[PDB]
Amino acid sequence: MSLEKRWSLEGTTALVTGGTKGIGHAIVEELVGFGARVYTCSRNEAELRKCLQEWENLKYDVTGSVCDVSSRTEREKLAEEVSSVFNGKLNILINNAGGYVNKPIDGFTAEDFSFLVAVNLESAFHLCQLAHPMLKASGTGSIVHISSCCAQIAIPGHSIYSSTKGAINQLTRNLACEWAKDNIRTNSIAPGAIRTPGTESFVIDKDALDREVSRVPFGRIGEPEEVASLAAFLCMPSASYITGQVICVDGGRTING
Amino acid sequence: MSLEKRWSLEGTTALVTGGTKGIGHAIVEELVGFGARVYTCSRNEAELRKCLQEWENLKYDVTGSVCDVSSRTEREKLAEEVSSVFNGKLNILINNAGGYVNKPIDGFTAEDFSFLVAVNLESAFHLCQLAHPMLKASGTGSIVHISSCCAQIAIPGHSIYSSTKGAINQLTRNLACEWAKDNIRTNSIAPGAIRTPGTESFVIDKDALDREVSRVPFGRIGEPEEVASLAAFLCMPSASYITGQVICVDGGRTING
Amino acid sequence: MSLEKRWSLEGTTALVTGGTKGIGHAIVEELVGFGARVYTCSRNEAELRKCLQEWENLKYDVTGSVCDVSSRTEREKLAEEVSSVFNGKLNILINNAGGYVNKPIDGFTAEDFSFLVAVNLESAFHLCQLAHPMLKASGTGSIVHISSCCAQIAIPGHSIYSSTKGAINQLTRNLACEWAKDNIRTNSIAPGAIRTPGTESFVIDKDALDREVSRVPFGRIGEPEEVASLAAFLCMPSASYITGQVICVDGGRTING
Amino acid sequence: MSLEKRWSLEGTTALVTGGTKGIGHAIVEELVGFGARVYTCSRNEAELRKCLQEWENLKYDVTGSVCDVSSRTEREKLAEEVSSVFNGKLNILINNAGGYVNKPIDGFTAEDFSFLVAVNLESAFHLCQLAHPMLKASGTGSIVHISSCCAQIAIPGHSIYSSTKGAINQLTRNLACEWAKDNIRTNSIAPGAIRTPGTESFVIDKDALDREVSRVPFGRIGEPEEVASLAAFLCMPSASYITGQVICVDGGRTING
Numbered sequence A, B, C, D: 001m002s003l004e005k006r007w008s009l010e011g012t013t014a015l016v017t018g019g020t021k022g023i024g025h026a027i028v029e030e031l032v033g034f035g036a037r038v039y040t041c042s043r044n045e046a047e048l049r050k051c052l053q054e055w056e057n058l059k060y061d062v063t064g065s066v067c068d069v070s071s072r073t074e075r076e077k078l079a080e081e082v083s084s085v086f087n088g089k090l091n092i093l094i095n096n097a098g099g100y101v102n103k104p105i106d107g108f109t110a111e112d113f114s115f116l117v118a119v120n121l122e123s124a125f126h127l128c129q130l131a132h133p134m135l136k137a138s139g140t141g142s143i144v145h146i147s148s149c150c151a152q153i154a155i156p157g158h159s160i161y162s163s164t165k166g167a168i169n170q171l172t173r174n175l176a177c178e179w180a181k182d183n184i185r186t187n188s189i190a191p192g193a194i195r196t197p198g199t200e201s202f203v204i205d206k207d208a209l210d211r212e213v214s215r216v217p218f219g220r221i222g223e224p225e226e227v228a229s230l231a232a233f234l235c236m237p238s239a240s241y242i243t244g245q246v247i248c249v250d251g252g253r254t255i256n257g
């Protein structure tokens, strides 16, 4: 295959969950930049519509619908609509929508636990199940989970969050092996702290920000496009022998003494 | 500290969940063998009572009550009874009770997912929360989770099982760091296939057994005491600088090419 | 930075050791395909000339000289010539040239050990030292080591080979943290078996080929461009927050049960 | 096998390199405490004699000779003498003697590199080869390498040191799989900073001490017996299903955020 085709997503179809802000928004734009047709969602109709209008103004081929991926019935309805829009063929599934709670282990409620498991683990698992027929039908499938680099280390307050992301890292391995025969690859990107609306209150908390940045060799938090570029690469034919991997995008955070 | 005291559990108190069969039964006996007073549980009153009678006949200091650790209210009642019996001081918590479903990713139901999360992950998490005061009050605490070596590799059918155990491996790291200041250590033992009542149908399935054993350098499945010995060691003062680790007891399975 | 610029190597200079065959040849072509000017080397003057003539006919900008990177004095001469050719500014260092011996542990000689350490570990370490000023001067330096996926698992015959690659994987982490202050990133690519006629490698005979085919979920060995693409990506501005990582390119080999 | 027998080293013979100070001295004492007969060595005849006299007064069975394990011919002479003393039957090989240099990457000399590879990697590899017949003859052989927790993270100054320990960690896996057929198990213990007056090590000065104290959740460096206990355990019948593992003994250092 030519270098040009190996580094392109021209003609492909993609579903990115949680695409109106932060990393997901950057992933939508990165995939469109390499020629993908993209479907996205969020929980907020007004914000999603504005995003879709902005993208249509820019001639970006993006469509979408409101979906709370923590709801089983909404996931079912999303997968049905995505299959209808893309005529049953999906090249790319990016499980980006997630959730976060920061508390000491002693403080987590049953509701905190169920919230994090549903949005970080069950959502991705069930969406993978639902998308398997159209990923297989595309003939070339790529699943990317957005995990977290803290699923390899212990950050104060992150116990249940990191545990659900560690579950995602293992699921990545099972998906990669079980669905290889369908020409579907599965990988996880594990970011460090990234500048997004989800981390705006963290950036305002200078004591917390400075402590985290002091552990990053690069001396700064990441930017959304520093995650999105790798997400696009992992979907390209260039990545055809990369499957089952968890790749940290963290400026050296996890390996820093 | 003397070698004798560093390799002893004399005077300690311990809670082992799921102690009537398999690995948990071997852990109860190993801890008692080093002088621990042990509390255990299972879901089956008749089998638990027979175990407790057998142990009393042998002069093993073991008590227990019926508890389904997948139930929030039963966990609360267990922790209250354990605290009452041990006068508020618990040296050792072994989270051994778990559950297992083997299906292709495509086949898992919502109920399979919720079953495995509740019994493998939420049970251990909540019991750790409930036991934290008495672990702290003991002055020297040790938590051991029984994970699985398949939380590092992809075994067909193990997707949700391995993912919940991978969550346990990460939780091990968070517990180890957050509660170090309370002199509590937390580690995980990750067995390969072990000969237990839980694997009896697997051993009858010679095609499945032979395939798994062909991947084990040692050419056999493990025995329960090969897990229980390490569980006892990790609770001894000898293990005072070991915390946050996931140790595979698998005959070389996970590292075998 | 625009998408086009983040995914470009225009204006960069690169040193790739061992570019005359196998993975290294594909890495040279991939870098030139994104606009890099490349310097390469090998021990075989005739093969090096033939490669350089072919790239000149293709209008690629590739330079080279004969160098045995297992020799300290030849590495010093190589680094001085590269610095002269590129006016003391080097964006990219790819340590690709390696050595391979396949024997049981009992069979390795002192010379096998010295051979493997010199070319797989010492050469990369010393070349990094020698290239540090040029890499620092570029302002966006990228070091890529080519390791092996077998630095995480045990493959028959691979003991010393895999051990030197495990050393490279750790060196990657030290380089990433010590030289982050110069905006030099260091990462390792760990291939599985790659189709490489003319190099002694992973696929030593039909038994090794059949073994790898059976253990890779995709049921095939990799192609050189499947490693080279990731090498190019890791050098692009798109990879600006990725450092200290060991990324397996092995079709799922190491994580497959 | 009874509990008492599974936790005993009665009737075993052991070779521990570098038993005159630091961790190795504690390992000798721990092995003798469980009934092992031990052979040890060092380069300092006066220190070796003083240690051997002290153990004789304590009625421990320890033998030794002067040996520089960085020398191929001296390793051959050591293995021949050990085989003579133990009549060709060795239960335990502990590769403890090491070397340590702390410099920035830019500062390492060719001699530093050769020094560290010879004692941390080549010595252990060649001693394993030389001891294989005696270990096989025992029927229950156990090899323990002493690695370092910094083979998983980047500590300032540790580049070549950590890299040689990363090589040891991989060699552990190859030995575990290749020699499982002889019932020889191989594992690595990876300590964090251990209080070791009289050896050049992790704690090079007050800045290193303060750093490690700040990064260890337990807020302290380790003690030699905290490594030695695990070394003894890994040699006991209790550890019969544990092989190919790298176990960190670091108070949580490597996994602490």
Ligand SMILES: NC(=O)c1ccc[n+]([C@@H]2O[C@H](COP(=O)([O-])OP(=O)(O)OC[C@H]3O[C@@H](n4cnc5c(N)ncnc54)[C@H](OP(=O)(O)O)[C@@H]3O)[C@@H](O)[C@H]2O)c1
Residues within 6 Å of the ligand: A017, A018, A019, A020, A021, A022, A023, A024, A041, A042, A043, A044, A047, A067, A068, A069, A070, A095, A096, A097, A098, A099, A100, A119, A146, A147, A148, A149, A190, A191, A192, A193, A194, A195, A196, A197, A198, A199
């Ligand atoms: N930022 C970091 O530092 C960081 C670090 C590591 C990992 N991550 C992971 O990166 C992923 C994205 O994080 P981010 O920081 O970019 O988050 P963010 O800025 O909060 O943006 C999240 C996006 O997802 C949508 N979303 C949230 N919950 C949803 C649900 N239940 N259903 C559908 N959409 C939902 C949000 O829109 P609505 O709220 O309108 O639905 C929004 O579009 C998450 O999985 C996160 O855990 C982030």
Ligand SMILES: NC(=O)c1ccc[n+]([C@@H]2O[C@H](COP(=O)([O-])OP(=O)(O)OC[C@H]3O[C@@H](n4cnc5c(N)ncnc54)[C@H](OP(=O)(O)O)[C@@H]3O)[C@@H](O)[C@H]2O)c1
Residues within 6 Å of the ligand: B017, B018, B019, B020, B021, B022, B023, B024, B041, B042, B043, B044, B047, B067, B068, B069, B070, B095, B096, B097, B098, B099, B100, B119, B146, B147, B148, B149, B190, B191, B192, B193, B194, B195, B196, B197, B198, B199
């Ligand atoms: N055996 C293996 O190959 C293997 C491998 C890797 C990991 N593991 C892990 O090892 C642990 C023990 O496994 P095992 O093979 O020894 O299992 P096992 O033979 O089935 O025995 C399980 C014990 O736990 C009790 N138990 C089960 N569910 C329970 C619940 N909800 N509440 C309280 N007790 C419960 C059982 O009694 P009742 O049913 O009467 O309650 C029994 O006493 C599990 O966490 C398992 O996932 C096992």
Ligand SMILES: NC(=O)c1ccc[n+]([C@@H]2O[C@H](COP(=O)([O-])OP(=O)(O)OC[C@H]3O[C@@H](n4cnc5c(N)ncnc54)[C@H](OP(=O)(O)O)[C@@H]3O)[C@@H](O)[C@H]2O)c1
Residues within 6 Å of the ligand: C017, C018, C019, C020, C021, C022, C023, C024, C041, C042, C043, C044, C047, C067, C068, C069, C070, C095, C096, C097, C098, C099, C100, C119, C146, C147, C148, C149, C190, C191, C192, C193, C194, C195, C196, C199, C200, C201, C202, C203
């Ligand atoms: N299946 C695989 O091929 C495989 C799998 C995993 C990892 N890897 C790793 O990937 C890298 C490339 O592997 P490869 O198989 O393509 O080839 P290789 O045999 O490692 O390297 C061959 C290239 O390097 C040159 N070379 C070798 N030794 C040299 C020396 N001392 N000085 C200068 N140049 C030298 C060769 O040319 P001359 O011989 O003419 O000098 C040739 O251009 C290596 O690090 C290898 O260990 C390969």
Ligand SMILES: NC(=O)c1ccc[n+]([C@@H]2O[C@H](COP(=O)([O-])OP(=O)(O)OC[C@H]3O[C@@H](n4cnc5c(N)ncnc54)[C@H](OP(=O)(O)O)[C@@H]3O)[C@@H](O)[C@H]2O)c1
Residues within 6 Å of the ligand: D017, D018, D019, D020, D021, D022, D023, D024, D041, D042, D043, D044, D047, D067, D068, D069, D070, D095, D096, D097, D098, D099, D100, D119, D146, D147, D148, D149, D190, D191, D192, D193, D194, D195, D196, D199, D200, D201, D202, D203
């Ligand atoms: N904080 C720590 O101390 C630390 C942390 C992590 C890992 N480790 C590892 O743990 C092991 C023990 O470390 P350590 O600090 O206690 O001591 P060390 O300096 O590695 O070893 C000292 C012992 O080995 C002997 N020795 C050294 N080089 C030798 C050679 N070439 N031939 C024969 N004997 C030799 C010494 O006696 P002579 O000098 O008299 O020969 C002494 O008995 C080493 O592998 C070390 O790398 C240590």
Ligand SMILES: O=Cc1ccc2c(c1)OCO2
Residues within 6 Å of the ligand: A100, A148, A149, A150, A155, A191, A192, A193, A194, A198, A199, A202, A212
């Ligand atoms: O979502 C919030 C968040 C904050 C800090 C983090 C992080 C996520 O991952 C590594 O450090």
Ligand SMILES: O=Cc1ccc2c(c1)OCO2
Residues within 6 Å of the ligand: B100, B148, B149, B150, B155, B191, B192, B193, B194, B198, B199, B202, B212
């Ligand atoms: O519980 C059942 C079970 C069966 C096979 C396994 C396993 C667990 O862990 C590694 O292989």
